[PDB]
Amino acid sequence: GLMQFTLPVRLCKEIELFHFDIGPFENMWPGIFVYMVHRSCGTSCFELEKLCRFIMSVKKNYRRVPYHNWKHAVTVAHCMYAILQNNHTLFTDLERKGLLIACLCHDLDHRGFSNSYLQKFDHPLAALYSTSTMEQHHFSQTVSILQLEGHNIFSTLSSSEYEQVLEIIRKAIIATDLALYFGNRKQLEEMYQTGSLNLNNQSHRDRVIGLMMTACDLCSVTKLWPVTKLTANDIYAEFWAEGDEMKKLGIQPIPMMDRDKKDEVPQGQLGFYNAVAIPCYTTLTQILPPTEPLLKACRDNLSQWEKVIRGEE
């Protein structure tokens, strides 16, 4: 069992940094992911034949949308890998397994619409799950692909460990609901400043993993400015498609989703960096100090968005 994956030199070095971009070659993303599972969890923790079959069924169940696509899934797995590798000792053998899989599956079958739009359209999924609609769907699709023949990457786990690792994956995928992030971060802020944060409290690990999930999900804000700029074009392309569908239901969309308010984009990024991103990576860096580079990179991009407003680009 001696089939170590390697990456060309620049990838082998740059993949270890939080600000790595996985590049434009779709057919290398699976090798990238396996390399991260091997270095992150051990070469022994998964059966390579089963893993590759799981990766490729997951890829097939991501859709051709401008942002919530397979490249996003792998980008979010890579950020999580950076966190695990710079916090080597804080995490169980199971959590390392669960959380990289969680990140790969966190947006399975996304069609580029918010929970809000499923509610107003009255989508069947909104009937089946009243909150975290898409996120309960993503988790449901994860379980499906696990129950296909030759796809149980967790076969060699006990019935017990199997149930623990699906529970890490479930809570991990739910926490990508940004509506939950606000309360989750408020509570973590208070536990850390009134000294009560304790990582043997399973109630507290859950919350911390939930914040890592927001961190990894938002990580386009933690890249070099030209990656951040170009990912924003993709995010808005989904946002403006959804607003078009809003107007089709007879509903004025929020400005975020109004392509007619393109002009205010930079001002709207400030809002988002100030209200969501900066507070996110702040609180995370307090709980897990080696994640500081995510904060630093977020501040730089916030500064780059200030430059756009002031006509200096």
Ligand X SMILES: CN(C)C(=O)c1cnn(C)c1C(=O)Nc1ccc2[nH]c(-c3ccccc3)nc2c1
Q: Look at residue 268 and give the partner it binds from Zn ion, Mg ion, ligand X, none, a contact being a CB closer than 5 to 8 Å depending on partner kind.
A: ligand X
Binding site feature residues for 3',5'-cyclic AMP: 68, 269
Stretch that binds Mg ion, among 18-26, 39-47, 172-180, 271-279 (CB under 5 A): 172-180
For ligand X (CB under 6 A), the number of binding residues is: 14
Give the whole-angstrom CA distance, residue 84 versus residue 90: 8
Nearer CB in complex with ligand X: 65/235: 235
- Does the annotation count 68 as an active-site position? yes
Shortest Å, Cβ 223 to Zn ion: 15
272 belongs to the binding site for ligand X (CB under 6 A): yes
Nearer CB in complex with Zn ion: 106/204: 106
Of 68, 78, 138, 151, which one is the catalytic site residue? Answer: 68
User: Could you tell me which residues come within 8 angstroms of residue 75 by beta carbon, excluding any fewer than 6 positions away?
Assistant: 21, 22, 219, 220
Structure tokens at 64: 């051709």
H-type helices in the chain, by residue range? 9-14, 29-41, 48-61, 70-86, 93-105, 115-121, 124-128, 133-146, 159-174, 178-193, 202-217, 225-249, 265-272, 278-287, 292-309
Shortest Å, Cβ 26 to ligand X: 21
User: Could you tell me which residues come within 8 angstroms of residue 24 by beta carbon, excluding any fewer than 6 positions away?
Assistant: none
Binding site feature residues: 68, 72, 106-107, 217, 269
Give the whole-angstrom CA distance, residue 215 versus residue 221: 9
107 belongs to the binding site for Zn ion (CB under 5 A): yes
Give the whole-angstrom CA distance, residue 221 versus residue 8: 26
x/- binding map, residues 198-217, to Zn ion, per CB under 5 A? -------------------x
Within 95-124, the residues that bind Mg ion by CB under 5 A are 107
Residue with tokens 């270890």: 16
Q: What is the DSSP string of 56-98?
A: HHHHHHS---SSSSHHHHHHHHHHHHHHHHHSTTSS-HHHHHH
Give the whole-angstrom CA distance, residue 302 versus residue 255: 20
Residue type, 14: E
231 belongs to the binding site for Mg ion (CB under 5 A): no
Binding site feature residues for 3',5'-cyclic GMP: 68, 269
Within 242-261, the residues that bind ligand X by CB under 6 A are 255-256, 261
265 belongs to the binding site for ligand X (CB under 6 A): yes
235 belongs to the binding site for ligand X (CB under 6 A): yes
Give the whole-angstrom CA distance, residue 110 versus residue 76: 15
Rg over CA atoms, the chain? 19
User: Could you tell me which residues come within 8 angstroms of residue 276 by beta carbon, excluding any fewer than 6 positions away?
Assistant: 178, 181, 218
Shortest Å, Cβ 305 to Mg ion: 23
Within 167-186, the residues that bind ligand X by CB under 6 A are 178
Q: Using the rule CB under 5 A, which residue among 176, 222, 285, 291 binds Mg ion?
A: 176
Give the whole-angstrom CA distance, residue 82 versus residue 219: 11
Shortest Å, Cβ 88 to ligand X: 28
User: Looking at beta carbons, which residue is closest to ligand X?
Assistant: 268
Structure tokens at 135: 């996120």
Shortest Å, Cβ 221 to Mg ion: 15
Positions in the binding site for ligand X (CB under 6 A):
178, 218, 220-221, 232, 235, 255-256, 261, 264-265, 268, 271-272
Residues marked active site are found at 68
Positions in the binding site for Mg ion (CB under 5 A):
107, 176
Positions in the binding site for Zn ion (CB under 5 A):
107, 217
